[PDB]
Design an enzyme around this catalytic site. Structure first.
Site, PDB file in Angstrom:
ATOM      1  N   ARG A  44       0.853  -1.304  -0.050  1.00 49.95           N
ATOM      2  CA  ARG A  44       0.128   0.069   0.051  1.00 49.95           C
ATOM      3  C   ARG A  44       0.926   1.324  -0.117  1.00 49.95           C
ATOM      4  O   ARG A  44       2.098   1.047  -0.063  1.00 49.95           O
ATOM      5  CB  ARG A  44      -1.039   0.202   1.233  1.00 49.95           C
TER       6      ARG A  44
ATOM      7  N   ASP B 219      -0.136  -1.822   8.614  1.00 52.69           N
ATOM      8  CA  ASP B 219       0.689  -0.644   8.796  1.00 52.69           C
ATOM      9  C   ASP B 219       1.881  -0.999   9.621  1.00 52.69           C
ATOM     10  O   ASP B 219       2.034  -1.989  10.288  1.00 52.69           O
ATOM     11  CB  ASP B 219       0.030   0.502   9.701  1.00 52.69           C
TER      12      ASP B 219
ATOM     13  N   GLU C  68      -1.108  13.402   6.993  1.00 55.68           N
ATOM     14  CA  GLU C  68      -0.905  13.022   5.828  1.00 55.68           C
ATOM     15  C   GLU C  68      -1.308  14.266   4.954  1.00 55.68           C
ATOM     16  O   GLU C  68      -2.433  14.550   4.677  1.00 55.68           O
ATOM     17  CB  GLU C  68      -1.412  11.622   5.106  1.00 55.68           C
TER      18      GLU C  68
ATOM     19  N   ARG D 129      -4.487  16.147   5.703  1.00 53.34           N
ATOM     20  CA  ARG D 129      -5.460  15.278   6.156  1.00 53.34           C
ATOM     21  C   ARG D 129      -5.452  15.706   7.814  1.00 53.34           C
ATOM     22  O   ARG D 129      -4.432  15.892   8.283  1.00 53.34           O
ATOM     23  CB  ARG D 129      -5.245  13.849   6.207  1.00 53.34           C
TER      24      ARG D 129
ATOM     25  N   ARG E 231     -13.952   5.223   0.837  1.00 59.33           N
ATOM     26  CA  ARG E 231     -12.967   5.246  -0.026  1.00 59.33           C
ATOM     27  C   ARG E 231     -13.444   4.534  -1.402  1.00 59.33           C
ATOM     28  O   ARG E 231     -12.836   3.381  -1.777  1.00 59.33           O
ATOM     29  CB  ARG E 231     -11.649   4.303   0.579  1.00 59.33           C
TER      30      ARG E 231
ATOM     31  N   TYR F 230      -5.624   5.596  -1.155  1.00 62.57           N
ATOM     32  CA  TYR F 230      -4.515   6.520  -1.465  1.00 62.57           C
ATOM     33  C   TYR F 230      -4.259   6.763  -2.767  1.00 62.57           C
ATOM     34  O   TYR F 230      -4.673   5.674  -3.575  1.00 62.57           O
ATOM     35  CB  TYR F 230      -3.554   5.974  -0.694  1.00 62.57           C
TER      36      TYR F 230
HETATM   37  C1  LIG Z   1       2.277   5.592   8.978  1.00 63.02           C
HETATM   38  C2  LIG Z   1       0.895   5.006   9.203  1.00 63.02           C
HETATM   39  O1  LIG Z   1       0.898   3.909  10.245  1.00 63.02           O
HETATM   40  N1  LIG Z   1       0.070   5.502   8.555  1.00 63.02           N
HETATM   41  C3  LIG Z   1      -1.328   5.134   8.399  1.00 63.02           C
HETATM   42  C4  LIG Z   1      -2.244   5.949   8.382  1.00 63.02           C
HETATM   43  C5  LIG Z   1      -2.482   6.483   9.898  1.00 63.02           C
HETATM   44  O2  LIG Z   1      -2.708   5.468  11.014  1.00 63.02           O
HETATM   45  C6  LIG Z   1      -3.518   7.585  10.120  1.00 63.02           C
HETATM   46  O3  LIG Z   1      -3.094   8.784   9.288  1.00 63.02           O
HETATM   47  C7  LIG Z   1      -3.476   8.177  11.719  1.00 63.02           C
HETATM   48  O4  LIG Z   1      -2.387   8.786  12.012  1.00 63.02           O
HETATM   49  O5  LIG Z   1      -3.868   5.450   8.187  1.00 63.02           O
HETATM   50  C8  LIG Z   1      -3.850   4.785   7.253  1.00 63.02           C
HETATM   51  C9  LIG Z   1      -5.069   4.550   6.448  1.00 63.02           C
HETATM   52  O6  LIG Z   1      -5.182   4.087   5.335  1.00 63.02           O
HETATM   53  O7  LIG Z   1      -5.754   5.137   7.034  1.00 63.02           O
HETATM   54  C10 LIG Z   1      -2.415   4.302   6.562  1.00 63.02           C
HETATM   55  C11 LIG Z   1      -1.226   4.341   6.881  1.00 63.02           C
HETATM   56  O8  LIG Z   1      -0.242   3.306   6.779  1.00 63.02           O
END
Ligand SMILES: CC(=O)N[C@H]1[C@H]([C@H](O)[C@H](O)CO)OC(C(=O)O)=C[C@@H]1O
Ligand SMILES: CC(=O)N[C@H]1[C@H]([C@H](O)[C@H](O)CO)O[C@@](O)(C(=O)O)C[C@@H]1O
Ligand SMILES: [Ca+2]
Ligand SMILES: [Ca+2]
Ligand SMILES: [Ca+2]
Ligand SMILES: [Ca+2]
EC number: 3.2.1.18
Length: 753
Positions: A200, A226, A595, A611, A688, A716
Site C-alpha cells: 500500500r 501498517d 498525511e 489530512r 474510499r 490513497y
Molecule cells: C504511517 C502510518 O501508520 N500511517 C497510516 C495512517 C495513520 O494510521 C493515520 O493517518 C492516523 O495517523 O492510516 C492509514 C489509513 O489507510 O488510514 C494508512 C497509513 O499506513
C-alpha cells in the site's frame, strides 16, 4: 495496457499484421503502406468491400476498461467516401463515431445513438491529417467525449447496444466505399495493476529531462498492515517505466539491504524529482518492526528515522540508502506553556564574589515568556525569548528597556541557539553570548535568590520552548548539568524526571512537557523542487521539500523537511499553526494534521493540503477532515487558510484519507492545479470509493470538478504531470491493488466549462 499501430517502412513491422492486428476485409477490400505524404502511413482501401483491422480482448480486459476507462487516439486523413470507423466494442456495447466526407467534400462526424452530424473541417483541411481522440470515463452513468485536434467536439456520448467484441479501425462497411490513411492508432485500457495488495501507500514522479521515465513507489507489506506490527516486515519497493508508464521493470526492494534481520519496517515513500540533476531522491521512514506511529507506540529511544535513496534517470541506476535521522529528528526536552506556566528551578550556592558561567541550548517554537535565568545571591539575570510580530527572535533582559533582535531570518528564528551567560565578579556584570558571539552586557537586578531556572513563566502568555542542555559552572566545577539531548535518547532504565534529578517544578494552569520527538515520517505522496522562489526572502530555487509528519509524544502535526544543497543536508521547518482550547481547565482540544501534500504556486507561495486525523473540532469550529495551509517563506512557516478546508472540494468523500495535489503546466505556458481524492459512493459520503479529479485555475482559491476517474474502490492516490498533455495517477483500488491511470488533462479540462 496499450494496443497500437505505428506506420513504418521497417520490414519487421511494415504492416498492421506485423504489429499484432488481424486483417478483416471482405470482397475487394484491401490496404497498402503509402509514403506519398513524406511519412509512411497505412492506406485502408475499402472500395468495393470492407477493409479494417481488429484486435481481440479478454473478459478481464473488458472489465478493466469498464471500471477504469479507456481512450482511443487516431492520426489519419480521409481520402474519400465514408464509414471510416475507429472504435471499441465490448460484446455488450460500443461508442461508435462515424467519420466521412459529405457530398461536398467536408470532413464530418456522426455518432451511433445520436442524430445529426458535426462538420469538423472544410476545404483542403478536410483531406489532411488530423488527430482524433475518444475518451471514456467510468461511472454509474459512463460516457465518452470526442476531440478533434485537441478540441472537444462531442461530450456525454452514450454507449449504444452491440454484440461486436473487438478494437477496430478502418472502413467498416462492405457497401459504403471508404479510403483513409493512418499514421498511428492507439487504444489504451486504463488501470493496469503495478503493485498488489496487501502492499500500500503509493507515490509517483516523472522526469522532465527524460520524457517517458516514471518512477513509482509503495510499501512492500509482508504480512500486511501498517508499520509497527510484529506480524509484518515492511520495506520500500519501486518500479520504473521508460515509455510513459505503459510498461514497467522488475519490482525492486530498496530497503531490505538495510533490514537484513527484518528488525525494521520502512514506510511512506516520498519521492522528489530534481530537474537540475535529472535524479529522483526518495525519502522514507524507518521504524523498529514492533512499534510505530499508530497509538503513539514509537518512543525517542527507538530506531525511528528517515533515510533516502537516489535514482539516476539517465543511466537507470539506484544508489544505496543514506541515513539523515540526526539532521531531522529532534532530541530535546519540550515545554509547551500553552494555557499555563511550567518552570524548573534548581537552588544553588553560587558565590557572587567570583566568576560563574551558564549555558542553555534553547529553541523557541512559538510565543513569549520563555526564559533562562540565573541568580547568584546578589543579582538575578533573566533572559526572556519571544517571537515578535514580524516573526523574528527577540530577547529582553531584566532591567534593560530596549529589546534585542537576535534573528530575522525565519529559519534561524526557530532553530536552536546556545545562550551563554558569563558573569564577571570584578566587573559586577554579566555578558550574554549567543552561539559564541558576544551580544550585550548587563547588571541584572538586585536579588537574594540563588538558583538557575528555565521554562515558560507566564500563564497568560502562550509559549513553547525546547531545551537540549543546561549547565552552570563556577571555579571550573559544574554545579548543575542537564543534558536533555542525551536523556531523550535513553531507555526508561535511565532517570529522566527533572524532579527526581534535583529540580523543582513550578506549574500553574494547563501545560505539557515531554522528551524529544517520538518520531518523524515523510508522509505519503511526492515532494517538490522549488523553482519560483526568486522573490521569496530566505528561500531559494532548487530547494527540495516535502511535508513530513512529526509526533512530539501524543500529537501529530506537519512540518517541512527541506534541503538547500541538493539533498545532502536537510533541515526542518516549523509545525503547522493550529487552534487549541482547554475545556473545563483540563481537556485539550486541538487538531492533528498528518498525511499532507504541497505544491508551489505561481508567485512562489506554497499551498499545503493536509489530512486532519482524530479530533477535528476546536472551540465549536469544525475544521473538516482536510485543511489547507499557506507558506510565504519557502516552507519554513505556515498559516491556516480560513474556510479553505474539505469544503472547497465539491463532492469529496467525508472520510479521512490521503490525497494528492500537483501543478500542471501546458506547452503554452499556462498552468493550474490538480487534486485527487475519493468522492465516496454516493459522492459526498464517507467511503474510499470513486476517485475524483479536481482542478484549480486560481491558485487554490476555488476548485472545479470533480471528474470521476474510477468506478469502484479508491483509497490513497498520487498524481504527477507526465508531459504537456497528460498526468499519471497511481491509486489504491480493489484490495488495495495499486493501478495506473494516464489522463489527458488538456482534453478533460474542457468537460468542466
Ligand atoms: C504511517 C502510518 O501508520 N500511517 C497510516 C495512517 C495513520 O494510521 C493515520 O493517518 C492516523 O495517523 O492510516 C492509514 C489509513 O489507510 O488510514 C494508512 C497509513 O499506513
Ligand atoms: C462499423 C460497423 O458496425 N459496420 C459493419 C457493417 C455496417 O453495419 C453496415 O455496412 C451498415 O452501414 O456491416 C457489416 O456486415 C459490413 O458491412 O461489413 C459488418 C461491419 O462491421
Ligand atoms: Ca526481509
Ligand atoms: Ca513490523
Ligand atoms: Ca498524499
Ligand atoms: Ca496520539
Amino acid at each position: 495496457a496499450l494496443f497500437d499501430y505505428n506506420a513504418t517502412g521497417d520490414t519487421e513491422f511494415d504492416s498492421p499484421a506485423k504489429q499484432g492486428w488481424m486483417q478483416d476485409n471482405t470482397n475487394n477490400g484491401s490496404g497498402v503502406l503509402t509514403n506519398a505524404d513524406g511519412m509512411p502511413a497505412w492506406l485502408v482501401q475499402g472500395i468495393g468491400g470492407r477493409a479494417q483491422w481488429t484486435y481481440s480482448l479478454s473478459t478481464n480486459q473488458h472489465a478493466q476498461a469498464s471500471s477504469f476507462g479507456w481512450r482511443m487516439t487516431t492520426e489519419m486523413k480521409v481520402l474519400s467516401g465514408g464509414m471510416i470507423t475507429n472504435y471499441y466494442a465490448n460484446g455488450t456495447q460500443r461508442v461508435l463515431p462515424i467519420i466521412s466526407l459529405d457530398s461536398s467534400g467536408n470532413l464530418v462526424v456522426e455518432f451511433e445513438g445520436q442524430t445529426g452530424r458535426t462538420v469538423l473541417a472544410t476545404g483542403t483541411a478536410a483531406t489532411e491529417y488530423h488527430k482524433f481522440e475518444l475518451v471514456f470515463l467510468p461511472g454509474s452513468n459512463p460516457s465518452a467525449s470526442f476531440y478533434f485536434d485537441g478540441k472537444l467536439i462531442r461530450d456525454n456520448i452514450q454507449p449504444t447496444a452491440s454484440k461486436q467484441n473487438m478494437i477496430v479501425w478502418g472502413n467498416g462497411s462492405s457497401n459504403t466505399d471508404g479510403v483513409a490513411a493512418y499514421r498511428d492508432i492507439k487504444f489504451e485500457i486504463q488501470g493496469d495493476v503495478i503493485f498488489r495488495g496487501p502492499d500500500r501507500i503509493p507515490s509517483i514522479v516523472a522526469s522532465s529531462v527524460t520524457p517517458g521515465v516514471v518512477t513509482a513507489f509503495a510499501e512492500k507489506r509482508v504480512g500486511g498492515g501498517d508499520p509497527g506490527a510484529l506480524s509484518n516486515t515492511n520495506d520500500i519497493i519501486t518500479r520504473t517505466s521508460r515509455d510513459g508508464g505503459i510498461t514497467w521493470d522488475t519490482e525492486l526492494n530498496l530497503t531490505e539491504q538495510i533490514n537484513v534481520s527484518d528488525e525494521f519496517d520502512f514506510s511512506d515513500p516520498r519521492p522528489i524529482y530534481d530537474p537540475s540533476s535529472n535524479t529522483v531522491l526518495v525519502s522514507y521512514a524507518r521504524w523498529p518492526t514492533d512499534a510505530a506511529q499508530n497509538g503513539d507506540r514509537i518512543k525517542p529511544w527507538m530506531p525511528n528515522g528517515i533515510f533516502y535513496s537516489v535514482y539516476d534517470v539517465a543511466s537507470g541506476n539506484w544508489q544505496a540508502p543514506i541515513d539523515v535521522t540526526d539532521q531531522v529528528k529532534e532530541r530535546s526536552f519540550q515545554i509547551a506553556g500553552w494555557g499555563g506556566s511550567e518552570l524548573y528551578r534548581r537552588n544553588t550556592s553560587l558565590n557572587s564574589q567570583q566568576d560563574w558561567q551558564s549555558n542553555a541550548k534553547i529553541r523557541i517554537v512559538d510565543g513569549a515568556a520563555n526564559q533562562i535565568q540565573v541568580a547568584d545571591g546578589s543579582r538575578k539575570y533573566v533572559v526572556t525569548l519571544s517571537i515578535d510580530e514580524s516573526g523574528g527572535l527577540v530577547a529582553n533582559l531584566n532591567g534593560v528597556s530596549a529589546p534585542i533582535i537576535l534573528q530575522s531570518e525565519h529559519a534561524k528564528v526557530h532553530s536552536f541557539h546556545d545562550y551563554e551567560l558569563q558573569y564577571s565578579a570584578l566587573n559586577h556584570t554579566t555578558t550574554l553570548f549567543v552561539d559564541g558571539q558576544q551580544i550585550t552586557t548587563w547588571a541584572g537586578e538586585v536579588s537574594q535568590e540563588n538558583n538557575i531556572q528555565f521554562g515558560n513563566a507566564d500563564a497568560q502568555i502562550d509559549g513553547r520552548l525546547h531545551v537540549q542542555k543546561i549547565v552552570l559552572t563556577q571555579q571550573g566545577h559544574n554545579l548543575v548539568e542537564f543534558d536533555a539531548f542525551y536523556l531523550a535518547q535513553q531507555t526508561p532504565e535511565v532517570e529522566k524526571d527533572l524532579e527526581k534529578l534535583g529540580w523543582t517544578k513550578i506549574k500553574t494552569g494547563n501545560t505539557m512537557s515531554l522528551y524529544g520527538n517520538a518520531s518523524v515520517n515523510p508522509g505519503p505522496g511526492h515532494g517538490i523542487t522549488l523553482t519560483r522562489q526568486q522573490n521569496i526572502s530566505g528561500s531559494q530555487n532548487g530547494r527540495l521539500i516535502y511535508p513530513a509528519i512529526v509526533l512530539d509524544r501524543f500529537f501529530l502535526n506537519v512540518m517541512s523537511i527541506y534541503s538547500d544543497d541538493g539533498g545532502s543536508n536537510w533541515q526542518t521547518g516549523s509545525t503547522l499553526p493550529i487552534p487549541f482550547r482547554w475545556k473545563s481547565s483540563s481537556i485539550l482540544e486541538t487538531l492533528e494534521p498528518s498525511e499532507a501534500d504541497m505544491v508551489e504556486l505561481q508567485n512562489g507561495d506554497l499551498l499545503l493540503t493536509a489530512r486532519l486525523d482524530f479530533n477535528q473540532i476546536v472551540n465549536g469550529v469544525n475544521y473538516s477532515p482536510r485543511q489547507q495551509f499557506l507558506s510565504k517563506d519557502g516552507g519554513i512557516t505556515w498559516s491556516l487558510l480560513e474556510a479553505n478546508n474539505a469544503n472547497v472540494f465539491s463532492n469529496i468523500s467525508t472520510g479521512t484519507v490521503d490525497a494528492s495535489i500537483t501543478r500542471f503546466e501546458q506547452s503554452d505556458g499556462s498552468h493550474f492545479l490538480l487534486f485527487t481524492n475519493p468522492q465516496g459512493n454516493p459522492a459526498g459520503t464517507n467511503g474510499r470509493q470513486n476517485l475524483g479529479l479536481w482542478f484549480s485555475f486560481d491558485e487554490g482559491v476555488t476548485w472545479k470538478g470533480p471528474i470521476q476517474l474510477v468506478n469502484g474502490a479508491s483509497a490513497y492516490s498520487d498524481i504527477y504531470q507526465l508531459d504537456s498533455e497528460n498526468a499519471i495517477v497511481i491509486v489504491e483500488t480493489d484490495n488495495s491493488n495499486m493501478r495506473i491511470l494516464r489522463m489527458p488533462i488538456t482534453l478533460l479540462k474542457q468537460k468542466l466549462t
